[PDB]
Amino acid sequence: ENSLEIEELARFAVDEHNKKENALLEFVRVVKAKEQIWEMDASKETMYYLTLEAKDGGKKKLYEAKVWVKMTHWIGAMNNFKELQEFKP
Amino acid sequence: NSLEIEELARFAVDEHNKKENALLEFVRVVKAKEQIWEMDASKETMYYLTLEAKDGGKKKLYEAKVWVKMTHWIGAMNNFKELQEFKPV
Amino acid sequence: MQIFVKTLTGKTITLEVEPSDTIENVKAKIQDKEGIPPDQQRLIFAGKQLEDGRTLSDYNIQKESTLHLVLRLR
Amino acid sequence: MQIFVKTLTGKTITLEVEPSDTIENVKAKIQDKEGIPPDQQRLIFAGKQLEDGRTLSDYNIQKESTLHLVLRLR
């Protein structure tokens, strides 16, 4: 929800897309970010819709990826699950 | 790394304090031993942390056992960690 | 009332229950709808493991509340 | 051989299988031992989603390998 955590989620999106399509995208930066959050007491579900710039052929191009991140914690433990939901130009 | 172990120890202390309504003050990590399971993707870890914590205000020594399972597949990553046992020396 | 049951990954189902109903009955509903036996269901709410003997109102599980479900694999 | 199936929390069950067995058959073993319907079982290995049609040898799931299981509530 801050620019450091968004930077890491964007690098996650680009890396996972690269591994999913055998692409070789060079992450440049995150231009815009939109998020949907549910913040139930002791839980945080988040769908991140990040529009970032990455250079596919060496020249920058613009892609929007949506990464799902669910932070579930209970009295003894916490889970942090994240999942790349979509990558698209 | 010593930061990730420090954060796992603070995790153990926070979760135990929440488990017994105790108020233990994390001091430092003195000794750490871990058992690691590896595989192509997931890395399972049982941490046996010997930490210093203040009970009444004076430092005391506690041994904590944290189970940490990081599971990631194409497109996603899971990070589950769980305080399995907390006991002094 | 309607409540939600989610897993650690965010998969969600919705069950119609009453605050008089017991956690055993809720787990039986999860068995009927999704097919997971109640002996495998470890239900979580308000940062607590739920006991099959107590009711939803005991744990202050109001209408439209969301629980989380972790598999036990007994 | 014996293989492991673990959940995201680190709870582990063990199934005795042969490399000829199918992911559908593995999910049938999981149903028999733990009772979770195969249609709810999404099996993960080597950073890949496992399909009910392919075999363990297709995925190079040798002895003492571990799969992961995520509940779907589909």
Author numbering:
A (entry chain B): 32 to 120
B (entry chain D): 33 to 121
C (entry chain C), D (entry chain A): 1 to 74
Original authors' sentences:
Ub can be ubiquitinated at any of eight primary amines (on the N-terminal amino group of M1 or the side chains of K6, K11, K27, K29, K33, K48, and K63), and all eight Ub linkage types co-exist in cells (Peng et al., 2003). Affimers are 12-kDa non-antibody scaffolds based on the cystatin fold (Tiede et al., 2014, Tiede et al., 2017), in which randomization of surface loops enables the generation of large (1010) libraries, against which epitopes can be screened and binders can be selected. To understand the observed linkage specificities, we determined crystal structures of the K6 and K33 affimers bound to their cognate diUb at 2.5 Å and 2.8 Å resolution, respectively. Both complexes show a conceptually similar interaction between affimers and diUb: each affimer molecule binds one Ub molecule and the affimer dimerizes to bind the two Ub moieties of a diUb in a linkage-specific manner. The variable loops are responsible for dimerization as well as Ub recognition, and specific dimerization provides two binding sites for Ub I44 patches with a defined distance and relative orientation, leading to specific, high-affinity recognition.
In the K33 affimer, the mode of dimerization is different. Both variable loops extend the existing β strands, which leads to the formation of an intermolecular β sheet. Ub interactions are mediated by the elongated β sheet and are centered on W105 that contacts the I44 patch. Additionally, E76 forms a salt bridge with K6 of Ub. Finally, we solved a 3.8-Å structure of the K33 affimer bound to K33 diUb in a different space group, which shows the same overall orientation and interactions. In contrast, the K33/K11 affimer is monomeric and only dimerizes upon diUb binding.
